[PDB]
Design a protein around this ligand. Structure first.
Ligand SMILES: NS(=O)(=O)c1c(F)c(F)c(S(=O)(=O)CCO)c(NCc2ccccc2)c1F
Ligand SMILES: [Zn+2]
Length: 258
Protein backbone atom coordinates (compact mmCIF):
# COMPACT_ATOMS: atom_id res chain seq x y z
CA UNK A 1 0.00 0.00 0.00
CA UNK A 2 2.68 2.55 -1.05
CA UNK A 3 1.48 5.72 -2.67
CA UNK A 4 2.15 9.48 -2.84
CA UNK A 5 -0.03 10.54 0.13
CA UNK A 6 1.51 11.89 3.43
CA UNK A 7 1.50 8.55 5.22
CA UNK A 8 2.71 6.36 2.31
CA UNK A 9 4.64 8.66 -0.04
CA UNK A 10 8.24 8.59 -1.38
CA UNK A 11 10.03 9.38 1.93
CA UNK A 12 8.42 6.32 3.49
CA UNK A 13 9.09 3.76 0.70
CA UNK A 14 12.43 2.77 2.22
CA UNK A 15 10.59 1.39 5.29
CA UNK A 16 9.30 -1.35 2.97
CA UNK A 17 11.72 -1.30 -0.01
CA UNK A 18 15.28 -0.78 1.29
CA UNK A 19 16.58 -0.47 -2.24
CA UNK A 20 14.96 3.11 -2.08
CA UNK A 21 18.40 4.14 -0.68
CA UNK A 22 20.39 2.21 -3.36
CA UNK A 23 23.46 3.15 -5.52
CA UNK A 24 21.44 3.72 -8.74
CA UNK A 25 18.05 5.30 -7.82
CA UNK A 26 15.91 7.48 -10.20
CA UNK A 27 14.79 10.16 -11.07
CA UNK A 28 17.83 12.52 -10.88
CA UNK A 29 18.67 16.12 -11.58
CA UNK A 30 20.39 16.35 -14.93
CA UNK A 31 23.18 18.97 -14.54
CA UNK A 32 24.23 19.82 -18.03
CA UNK A 33 27.68 21.08 -17.11
CA UNK A 34 28.62 17.72 -15.53
CA UNK A 35 27.06 15.85 -18.47
CA UNK A 36 29.56 14.07 -20.71
CA UNK A 37 29.12 14.17 -24.54
CA UNK A 38 29.81 10.56 -25.82
CA UNK A 39 30.44 9.80 -29.57
CA UNK A 40 29.86 6.07 -29.04
CA UNK A 41 26.16 6.80 -28.33
CA UNK A 42 23.97 5.84 -31.27
CA UNK A 43 20.87 7.78 -32.39
CA UNK A 44 17.68 6.20 -31.12
CA UNK A 45 15.90 4.01 -33.64
CA UNK A 46 12.28 3.24 -32.95
CA UNK A 47 9.96 0.73 -34.66
CA UNK A 48 6.40 1.12 -33.57
CA UNK A 49 3.01 -0.32 -34.45
CA UNK A 50 -0.10 1.65 -33.42
CA UNK A 51 -2.16 -1.59 -33.31
CA UNK A 52 0.37 -2.83 -30.63
CA UNK A 53 -1.56 -0.76 -28.05
CA UNK A 54 -4.27 -2.85 -26.40
CA UNK A 55 -5.72 -1.20 -23.25
CA UNK A 56 -5.50 1.67 -20.79
CA UNK A 57 -6.03 1.27 -17.07
CA UNK A 58 -5.74 3.11 -13.81
CA UNK A 59 -3.08 1.49 -11.70
CA UNK A 60 -3.82 3.73 -8.77
CA UNK A 61 -0.45 5.35 -9.43
CA UNK A 62 -0.85 6.62 -12.97
CA UNK A 63 -2.72 5.49 -16.05
CA UNK A 64 -0.96 2.70 -18.06
CA UNK A 65 -1.29 1.96 -21.74
CA UNK A 66 -0.23 -1.79 -22.13
CA UNK A 67 0.88 -3.17 -25.46
CA UNK A 68 1.18 -6.66 -26.98
CA UNK A 69 4.74 -7.65 -26.45
CA UNK A 70 5.05 -11.21 -27.96
CA UNK A 71 6.67 -9.90 -31.21
CA UNK A 72 9.28 -7.33 -32.16
CA UNK A 73 6.75 -5.02 -33.82
CA UNK A 74 7.38 -2.11 -31.36
CA UNK A 75 10.97 -1.85 -30.22
CA UNK A 76 13.61 0.58 -29.18
CA UNK A 77 17.20 0.05 -30.34
CA UNK A 78 20.32 2.12 -30.74
CA UNK A 79 21.01 4.83 -28.24
CA UNK A 80 23.07 3.39 -25.36
CA UNK A 81 21.40 -0.01 -25.72
CA UNK A 82 22.81 -3.33 -26.90
CA UNK A 83 20.16 -5.37 -28.58
CA UNK A 84 16.43 -4.91 -28.91
CA UNK A 85 14.08 -3.58 -26.23
CA UNK A 86 10.47 -4.52 -26.59
CA UNK A 87 7.74 -1.95 -25.78
CA UNK A 88 5.65 -2.89 -22.73
CA UNK A 89 3.70 0.11 -21.39
CA UNK A 90 3.42 3.92 -21.33
CA UNK A 91 2.41 6.05 -18.30
CA UNK A 92 2.73 9.66 -17.06
CA UNK A 93 3.89 11.55 -13.91
CA UNK A 94 2.64 15.02 -12.85
CA UNK A 95 2.45 17.23 -9.83
CA UNK A 96 -0.32 19.26 -8.14
CA UNK A 97 0.91 22.48 -9.79
CA UNK A 98 1.41 22.97 -13.55
CA UNK A 99 4.99 24.09 -13.12
CA UNK A 100 6.43 21.31 -10.97
CA UNK A 101 5.38 17.79 -12.09
CA UNK A 102 8.26 16.05 -13.85
CA UNK A 103 10.38 13.32 -12.21
CA UNK A 104 13.72 14.31 -13.74
CA UNK A 105 14.74 17.97 -13.48
CA UNK A 106 17.22 19.77 -15.72
CA UNK A 107 19.56 22.37 -14.12
CA UNK A 108 17.09 23.18 -11.34
CA UNK A 109 14.04 23.30 -13.67
CA UNK A 110 11.00 21.01 -13.46
CA UNK A 111 8.54 20.48 -16.34
CA UNK A 112 4.77 20.22 -16.09
CA UNK A 113 4.86 16.47 -16.43
CA UNK A 114 6.90 13.58 -17.76
CA UNK A 115 5.89 10.65 -19.97
CA UNK A 116 7.60 7.24 -19.48
CA UNK A 117 7.78 4.62 -22.21
CA UNK A 118 8.95 1.34 -20.71
CA UNK A 119 10.71 -1.45 -22.73
CA UNK A 120 12.40 -4.77 -21.86
CA UNK A 121 15.36 -6.70 -23.25
CA UNK A 122 13.62 -9.59 -25.08
CA UNK A 123 16.93 -10.58 -26.74
CA UNK A 124 18.13 -11.76 -23.30
CA UNK A 125 15.16 -12.37 -21.00
CA UNK A 126 11.91 -14.32 -21.36
CA UNK A 127 9.56 -11.77 -19.92
CA UNK A 128 9.18 -8.21 -18.73
CA UNK A 129 9.04 -9.37 -15.08
CA UNK A 130 12.29 -11.24 -15.41
CA UNK A 131 14.08 -8.36 -17.28
CA UNK A 132 13.05 -5.96 -14.47
CA UNK A 133 15.43 -7.91 -12.21
CA UNK A 134 18.57 -7.43 -14.36
CA UNK A 135 20.82 -4.37 -14.72
CA UNK A 136 20.48 -4.43 -18.54
CA UNK A 137 16.89 -5.57 -18.45
CA UNK A 138 14.80 -2.39 -18.98
CA UNK A 139 15.06 0.78 -21.10
CA UNK A 140 12.74 3.68 -20.31
CA UNK A 141 12.33 6.63 -22.57
CA UNK A 142 11.46 9.84 -20.68
CA UNK A 143 9.75 12.78 -22.49
CA UNK A 144 9.08 16.09 -20.72
CA UNK A 145 5.74 17.87 -21.11
CA UNK A 146 5.38 21.64 -20.91
CA UNK A 147 2.15 23.69 -21.02
CA UNK A 148 1.39 24.59 -24.71
CA UNK A 149 -0.85 23.47 -27.67
CA UNK A 150 -2.91 20.24 -26.87
CA UNK A 151 -1.38 17.06 -28.26
CA UNK A 152 -4.02 14.97 -30.11
CA UNK A 153 -2.67 11.70 -28.79
CA UNK A 154 -2.78 13.14 -25.29
CA UNK A 155 -6.36 14.02 -26.06
CA UNK A 156 -7.03 10.36 -27.08
CA UNK A 157 -5.78 9.53 -23.51
CA UNK A 158 -7.68 12.18 -21.65
CA UNK A 159 -10.94 11.22 -23.33
CA UNK A 160 -10.78 7.83 -21.49
CA UNK A 161 -10.08 9.03 -17.98
CA UNK A 162 -13.76 9.27 -16.85
CA UNK A 163 -14.10 5.50 -17.75
CA UNK A 164 -11.08 4.57 -15.61
CA UNK A 165 -11.57 6.95 -12.64
CA UNK A 166 -11.27 4.26 -9.90
CA UNK A 167 -8.13 2.19 -9.32
CA UNK A 168 -8.29 -1.11 -11.25
CA UNK A 169 -10.69 0.04 -14.00
CA UNK A 170 -9.61 -0.26 -17.63
CA UNK A 171 -10.76 0.15 -21.20
CA UNK A 172 -9.89 -0.87 -24.85
CA UNK A 173 -7.15 1.37 -26.21
CA UNK A 174 -5.56 0.84 -29.62
CA UNK A 175 -4.48 2.67 -32.76
CA UNK A 176 -2.26 4.74 -30.49
CA UNK A 177 0.10 7.10 -32.22
CA UNK A 178 2.89 6.97 -29.59
CA UNK A 179 5.50 8.33 -32.01
CA UNK A 180 3.53 11.55 -32.00
CA UNK A 181 4.17 11.96 -28.26
CA UNK A 182 7.82 12.28 -29.06
CA UNK A 183 9.37 15.64 -29.91
CA UNK A 184 10.94 16.32 -33.33
CA UNK A 185 14.40 16.29 -31.89
CA UNK A 186 15.51 12.91 -30.51
CA UNK A 187 18.66 14.22 -28.71
CA UNK A 188 18.84 12.59 -25.21
CA UNK A 189 20.74 12.11 -22.00
CA UNK A 190 21.30 8.68 -20.56
CA UNK A 191 22.32 7.15 -17.20
CA UNK A 192 21.87 3.91 -15.32
CA UNK A 193 19.03 3.96 -12.70
CA UNK A 194 15.87 2.36 -11.43
CA UNK A 195 12.11 2.18 -11.44
CA UNK A 196 10.81 5.41 -9.83
CA UNK A 197 8.04 3.45 -8.01
CA UNK A 198 8.34 0.46 -5.69
CA UNK A 199 9.94 -2.16 -6.15
CA UNK A 200 12.49 0.50 -7.23
CA UNK A 201 14.59 -2.15 -9.06
CA UNK A 202 17.93 -0.92 -10.44
CA UNK A 203 17.29 -2.37 -13.88
CA UNK A 204 16.78 0.76 -16.00
CA UNK A 205 18.89 2.34 -18.73
CA UNK A 206 17.27 5.83 -18.64
CA UNK A 207 17.06 7.72 -21.90
CA UNK A 208 15.60 11.25 -21.27
CA UNK A 209 14.81 13.41 -24.31
CA UNK A 210 16.03 17.06 -24.14
CA UNK A 211 13.05 18.52 -26.02
CA UNK A 212 9.63 18.66 -24.33
CA UNK A 213 6.28 18.13 -25.94
CA UNK A 214 3.21 20.18 -25.28
CA UNK A 215 0.13 19.54 -23.16
CA UNK A 216 -2.66 21.99 -22.30
CA UNK A 217 -3.49 22.91 -18.70
CA UNK A 218 -6.99 21.45 -19.19
CA UNK A 219 -5.55 18.18 -20.51
CA UNK A 220 -3.12 18.05 -17.60
CA UNK A 221 -5.74 18.84 -15.01
CA UNK A 222 -7.84 15.82 -16.14
CA UNK A 223 -5.10 13.40 -14.86
CA UNK A 224 -5.53 14.77 -11.28
CA UNK A 225 -9.15 13.59 -11.11
CA UNK A 226 -8.06 9.92 -11.40
CA UNK A 227 -8.39 8.15 -8.06
CA UNK A 228 -5.63 6.24 -6.25
CA UNK A 229 -8.47 4.38 -4.46
CA UNK A 230 -10.71 1.61 -5.71
CA UNK A 231 -14.56 1.56 -6.23
CA UNK A 232 -16.27 1.72 -2.79
CA UNK A 233 -13.13 2.83 -0.93
CA UNK A 234 -13.13 6.39 0.50
CA UNK A 235 -11.95 8.41 -2.47
CA UNK A 236 -8.47 9.92 -2.60
CA UNK A 237 -7.23 11.78 -5.74
CA UNK A 238 -3.98 11.16 -7.58
CA UNK A 239 -3.13 14.92 -7.68
CA UNK A 240 0.65 14.28 -7.74
CA UNK A 241 2.68 11.12 -8.55
CA UNK A 242 6.29 12.18 -9.01
CA UNK A 243 9.26 10.96 -6.95
CA UNK A 244 11.86 13.58 -5.92
CA UNK A 245 15.35 13.52 -7.59
CA UNK A 246 17.62 10.98 -5.86
CA UNK A 247 21.36 11.15 -5.08
CA UNK A 248 23.50 10.77 -8.17
CA UNK A 249 26.13 8.81 -6.24
CA UNK A 250 28.75 9.60 -8.90
CA UNK A 251 26.90 8.06 -11.82
CA UNK A 252 27.82 9.49 -15.26
CA UNK A 253 25.04 11.13 -17.32
CA UNK A 254 26.07 11.16 -21.02
CA UNK A 255 24.68 13.23 -23.83
CA UNK A 256 24.05 12.17 -27.46
CA UNK A 257 24.59 15.80 -28.56
CA UNK A 258 26.91 18.78 -28.13
N1 LIG B 1 8.16 5.42 -13.36
S1 LIG B 1 8.42 3.68 -13.68
O1 LIG B 1 8.89 3.58 -15.12
O2 LIG B 1 9.63 3.27 -12.86
C1 LIG B 1 6.84 2.86 -13.24
C2 LIG B 1 5.69 3.59 -12.86
F1 LIG B 1 5.59 4.93 -12.80
C3 LIG B 1 4.50 2.93 -12.52
F2 LIG B 1 3.45 3.71 -12.18
C4 LIG B 1 4.41 1.52 -12.55
S2 LIG B 1 2.88 0.71 -12.00
O3 LIG B 1 3.40 -0.56 -11.26
O4 LIG B 1 2.46 1.50 -10.74
C5 LIG B 1 1.52 0.23 -13.08
C6 LIG B 1 0.97 -1.12 -12.57
O5 LIG B 1 0.32 -1.79 -13.60
C7 LIG B 1 5.53 0.75 -12.89
N2 LIG B 1 5.51 -0.71 -12.86
C8 LIG B 1 6.39 -1.25 -11.85
C9 LIG B 1 6.97 -2.60 -12.04
C10 LIG B 1 7.83 -2.89 -13.11
C11 LIG B 1 8.41 -4.18 -13.25
C12 LIG B 1 8.10 -5.16 -12.29
C13 LIG B 1 7.23 -4.88 -11.22
C14 LIG B 1 6.66 -3.61 -11.10
C15 LIG B 1 6.72 1.44 -13.23
F3 LIG B 1 7.80 0.74 -13.59
ZN1 LIG C 1 7.39 6.33 -14.61
Amino acid sequence: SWGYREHNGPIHWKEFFPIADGDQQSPIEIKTKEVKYDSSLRPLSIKYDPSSAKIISNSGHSFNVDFDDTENKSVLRGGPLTGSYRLRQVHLHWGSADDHGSEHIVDGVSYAAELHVVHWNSDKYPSFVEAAHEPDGLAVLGVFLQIGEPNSQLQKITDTLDSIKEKGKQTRFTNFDLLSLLPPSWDYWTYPGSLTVPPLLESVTWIVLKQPINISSQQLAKFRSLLCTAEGEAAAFLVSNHRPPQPLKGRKVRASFH
